[PDB]
Design a protein around this ligand. Structure first.
Ligand code: NI
Ligand code: NI
Ligand code: NI
Lengths: 585, 585, 585
């Protein structure tokens, strides 16, 4: 009677992990999706994992039918991918488990390996194929890959069990300032590849100040002596890459036009190896820090930014391509050259669109507030998510900063945890800057945090005029501080319910929010070491912490309403500043 | 930064407990309810307990307003008491926290102590009054009492934070076979009493075989020497009780008509002590076991029973008086003299109506499936709920059996935990029988479980013809067993979706369910040691484990549909059996 | 290309008919229903019958999948039995085909024959089992039986294709004055019987004027020599019946209390033959005609009647038991001893409830208006429906009159068709009277119709004061006529929209309807040869011919509104008349 008497029914599924080490490079690969209607059940008590519905035991050993608690083909249907919270109002506040199943046929036209990719599933995803357990993924915003070659038949049943439960030891914890959207909400794909295939492919301008050297790195699925053929036709590049034990790299001379948000030049690149082919569309640029300067392609820059969550009234966390394009267009209308994508990895199409339309990006993992920094398995979770993100987005010129977390306490255990993450980012990616968003040192009203020593760029969150209501605290904060690194003010802002007006002293009104922006900008614009800002936030987003009548379960710090149809007065305050900077160059 | 960086934000509230030791006797006490509209928020991340909204800190020390995430008087309103899951479809699957608040005025007309009673709140209830923490209750089906005398002002604000979260270490665990209804779902009351008041009052027929002696026990809120006076005018009784250190008892002669379900005679009793008065309405009966016989008032009985959950389509767990009367009336129409109230304490009005209308009762605590038997604090939770139940219902003649749990594994840790619970019940109540529902010993197909040694009556659950599909296992089971004490078959049955028909071999149909009842009765009715049965169950109830098309998130073992408007064929099978037994006397 | 180029795709299904000759007697037989949720499609073009979906050809001979236009297990679900028109507003006016399918398991515990019964399906029902065609039924209001023994497997799929299409050559034609309710709307059953089983059982009081002799006739499924034994324990009866070639009968002495509506005495009767047993619950009464007198148990009666359709706002033609009880109770409150069930066989439970509650009945087949009297296959359809009705209801004491049709033209072809139907009824049932509802002879304003010669009782429809607006035509009609047999006025009345008032000259108002009843009763009550009346009608019913603002697609001649919650003034006019007759005895 283990289905009712087994206390630790999940331990048996802690195997077959999808991790950064099972990802494959997808550029240029044809994929068949499993998007569509899946039969589903709400599984509030995790009954599928206790009773093992995926085994489909309908009769006992003696031929008697047994009672069952599921009916796969007669279950209702839900269109995947989606955040299930926005499918039906009954599911808005549901954060337990749902079980999804469908069938598909499989015929190999040649010898091939097949991966299942789940583009994102929050928070846990357990995979079953033809009655057998494939494995699981932990972490709610990164793609998960499993080699399913050995499970496939001519006709298949796949089951996905997805648990939205919040837990203090997860990354993030159970307490955040955003909405817990659950389910399988980015594309589900089948990827056929040769037995010997390209597993990783990384390419970048070498950040040596000459703008004339390009590095490319390849690893294969097998330890083999081989070569790859790299082609960049527009740059006249055709170079051999020699592979030893399935890995190799090359550095070669080239003269690309350097990518900027204003001139987002991209190049088609193609790599062959054995019978395999991949391709990408990549820009070349150098991002460095020199003293207090942020240098893009050798030139100091001011990052005119805005923060942005992955939220949608209709789609929850599963934004469409159109919604991503809208966010970039509105940010550029606002005058931005930079966007802070908070607080987790967004859909990879965001950085691809930023590559194409021209917008610098900061990408982040949800090491947020009271992470269990002492727990080794929590470190393993965080480091895997960091490395998944870096591996997924390595070739995105638009991305210039990896952030290892946000608003964590300055304790010994936090410093060990997050400094090692910062070292991990640097080791995984020699081309990009590493940052994090820190709280103000309240005792000294000072930019001072032990983590900052390990960062290329300091992010500081401050809410003077709001959570720190006395505006005079802001000039004092900047006078008290003299960092030797560039500073991005990674958050400031104020709530305003759309169309809620009052005096500038009425916190929560449009007038007060615009007044906060006026005072913030008047101080920050003349601090020499502040080299950017990403005010919180582009538009209102669902938020379980905000319950007042002038919040209505949305964080109201957006410069636009939650459907992005309406611009609040503070939008035009920030825009006027950014357009001034643009006019000055 | 405590509200965002404190990991263990709940430890500070582990104080001011409501327990069996803070209960007061309520019979004959005037109460003022706080039922009504309460302003409320969905508090998914427990923000109220982290930010301490109940302190209502609206300005800082320098007079600046600070942003806040709540608005008590402008929140929407929910009528309490209720299960919040049936209030709106958005809350059906919500099992986090909600925060409720309202105001009330208080004027003492004489010196008095005041208790707050929360009739039931699942699972945790934290109480705040005028910005101060009063305390909390743990356990989802028993009434909670706090002395609030020292918190009261002329105008008051009360805040209740109620957490529906399921946890493995709770009682029950996170895995049950019933629906997790959450909220404050029985009466909220203010109770004014003298400073020295009657704290407990227990009265029962002495089970000495004469039916002519009555015991009465009183304790006071103060450890003093005093006399109480007990009056039963209809029986010519007036007796003093000498109290010492706040406690005393007396045994006296009386000639009551003995309570039975067929003739449920009740008597008004009144007790005074100092300036305090309490009263009750009680029946007098003797319940004993002799060998394999269950004896009511000296005569062997067969308990023609049905099991029953506290479930309602419209009201969730917060059944109305009319719904309880309906359940009793339908049970009696079915031919029952007995009902198993599963698996937790029902509203105390159930046993009061059973006293009045005439139905014998089994009441139970949710020590169900995989309880953390090794954890001392889990034992403390279970023991407290057991003692709350017994103290609440001590004077209910209809209740004859306390059950200490259901379908637990026969392990050493379980045995230590549940045998000590059974000893607790025996020590707390010398007048009633103790039982539990046990699984069949699958190794021997036998009624054999180490806990049975500690019980007066053996409860056995068996599902031959259903989960044990071979009917032949049932005669084998009864042949293999020769218990020395009475056996109640506390569960058997089969799913049937209302109006879903098929052949008797189609599991899940009405015809198969009726066939299972026919074969169960044919065997059970001729087993000498089976003195009762409570088939599972009177009517269909919400059940998160049952997801098939012929279940629809209801357990379908009811003899009636979930609205009790429709009787399935198996209803008449059982009814015919019970009416034969009644015909025979 | 058969599914697209075959013009006559239905001819292949004109086989395996369910007819009166395949019916079996059901009294006392255990049945397993197939009522429940069936997966279904709207099949507007009869694609299932052209493409043969029931063969489930999913792959071609080379193993390729082929496209299909159905998905049995993933279709939506409809609860059967029902009139599909009242299931959803989208189906109210749908009268094409629908396809229903489900599965069921079958295990024979002994050698047995199995019948499928479809209690009623309007108009055509085609049956498929495990991919094979079983057969079909024609006729929308009678039960259909097919021997499916040789089709059954351990796991079965049944498909029912049901066509509601109206056709001029059907019985009824495409033009009626009632609503075309479609679908399988009475119980679907599986019936297990011995190979040699009792096929028909008929029992009645011998109409020889002694009231002391009972006849009983039995036929078997096999043409063998055997004895049956008949028992009526309450009357001290036990008699053998000698069967030869599968058939025999017996007449025996018995002293039953004679059934009347006021004292509806019934008796349990049981018949055994070999291993088979059937039983029934029957009353004993004599119905005869002598001159102009209708004699019940030897006494002249006046039939205080009302007409009644099988109509329900919520359920369409699939009335519940409660709705039938309501119709009988309201008729008796109106003062009726008699009801005309128009214009087709109602659920057989109607006459069983009339047996029990006490109401005399007229039952009728829908040979209505412009039947294709010249077409032999239309005659075959009508004769079969008549014989199905008579075989179904032979043992119902409440039924005293079989009606062979309604308001047909007095032509030579009609006379040949309907007189042979009347001879059929007489030959099939020696115990009951035969009638029909005839139009007034408009040339003579006279009761005169060539079919009346073949009837025991004359039914005349007349609408003086309504369709014949001059009331003076009614006394003229009765003056012009001097029939030699009893006359029942089988229809009169007037529209009244509930709560629609006006002057007595406003046709369509309550006042005018009451005025018509006053004048009808004033004349009819003093005509010597009028021995009964069944005014049209008890309550408003759906009617596609009535489109005015004061009709709203209902026939408004009811004495009550369509939900039977409201009694119009004419209700009390008729009630006052019937209670005067009852007062007089
Ligand atoms: Ni406005
Ligand atoms: Ni039914
Ligand atoms: Ni009126």
């Amino acid at each position: 009677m283990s289905d009712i008497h087994l206390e630790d029914y999940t331990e048996q599924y802690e195997t077959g992990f999808a991790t950064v080490d099972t990802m494959i490079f997808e550029g240029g690969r044809r994929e068949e999706l499993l998007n569509g209607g899946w039969h589903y059940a709400v599984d509030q008590y995790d009954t599928c994992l206790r009773q093992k519905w995926y085994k489909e035991r309908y009769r006992d050993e003696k031929g008697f039918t047994v009672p069952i608690d599921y009916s796969f083909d007669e279950w209702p249907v839900m269109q995947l991918p989606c955040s299930w919270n926005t499918i039906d109002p009954m599911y808005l506040l549901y954060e337990g488990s749902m079980v999804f199943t469908r069938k598909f046929s499989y015929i190999a036209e040649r010898e091939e390996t097949v991966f299942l990719k789940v583009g994102a599933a929050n928070y846990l995803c357990r995979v079953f194929l033809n009655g057998k357990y494939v494995g699981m993924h932990r972490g709610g915003s990164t793609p998960a890959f499993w080699n399913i070659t050995e499970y496939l038949k001519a006709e298949n049943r796949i089951v996905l069990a997805v648990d939205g439960t919040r837990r203090p030891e997860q990354v993030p914890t159970e307490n955040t300032d955003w909405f817990n959207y659950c389910g399988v909400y980015r594309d589900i794909a089948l990827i056929r590849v040769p037995k010997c295939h390209i597993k990783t492919f990384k390419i970048a301008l070498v950040p040596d100040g000459t703008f004339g050297h390009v590095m490319a790195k390849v690893t294969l699925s097998e330890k083999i002596t081989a070569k790859a053929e790299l082609v960049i036709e527009e740059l006249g590049v055709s170079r051999k890459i020699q592979l030893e034990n399935g890995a190799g790299e090359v550095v070669f001379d080239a003269k690309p036009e350097l990518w900027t948000p204003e001139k987002p030049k991209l190049y088609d690149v193609k790599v062959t190896c054995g019978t395999d082919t991949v391709s990408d569309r990549v820009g070349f640029r150098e991002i460095r820090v020199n003293g207090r300067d942020i240098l893009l392609n050798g030139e100091p820059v001011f990052l005119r930014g805005i923060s942005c969550h992955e939220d949608s009234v209709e789609n929850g966390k599963g934004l469409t391509r159109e919604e991503r394009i809208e966010n970039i267009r509105i940010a550029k209308e606002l005058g931005c050259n930079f966007m802070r994508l908070a607080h987790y990895p967004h859909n990879e199409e965001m950085a691809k669109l930023a590559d194409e339309l021209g917008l610098l990006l900061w990408e982040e993992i949800p090491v947020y507030w009271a992470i269990r920094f002492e727990r080794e398995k929590t470190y393993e979770d965080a480091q895997n998510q960091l490395r998944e993100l870096i591996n997924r987005d390595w070739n995105r010129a638009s991305v210039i900063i990896w952030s290892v977390g946000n608003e964590n306490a300055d304790t010994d255990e936090r410093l060990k945890f997050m400094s090692v993450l910062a070292e991990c980012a640097h080791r995984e990616d020699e081309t990009r800057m590493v940052s994090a968003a820190c709280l103000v040192n309240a005792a000294k009203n000072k930019i001072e945090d032990r983590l900052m020593e390990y960062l290329d760029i300091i992010g500081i969150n401050e809410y003077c005029g709001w959570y720190t209501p006395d505006f005079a605290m802001l000039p004092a904060l900047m006078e008290n501080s003299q960092p030797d690194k560039p500073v991005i003010v990674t958050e400031f802002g104020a709530d305003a319910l759309p169309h809620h007006h009052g005096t500038i002293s009425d916190k929560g009104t449009e007038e007060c929010q615009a007044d906060v922006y006026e005072k913030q900008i008047a101080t920050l614009r003349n601090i020499d070491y502040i080299k950017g800002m990403t005010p919180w936030i582009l538009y209102d987003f669902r938020c379980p912490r905000r319950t007042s009548l002038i919040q209505k379960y949305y964080n109201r710090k957006g410069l636009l309403s939650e459907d992005k149809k309406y611009r609040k007065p503070a939008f035009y305050v920030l825009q006027k500043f950014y357009e001034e900077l643009k006019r000055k160059e």
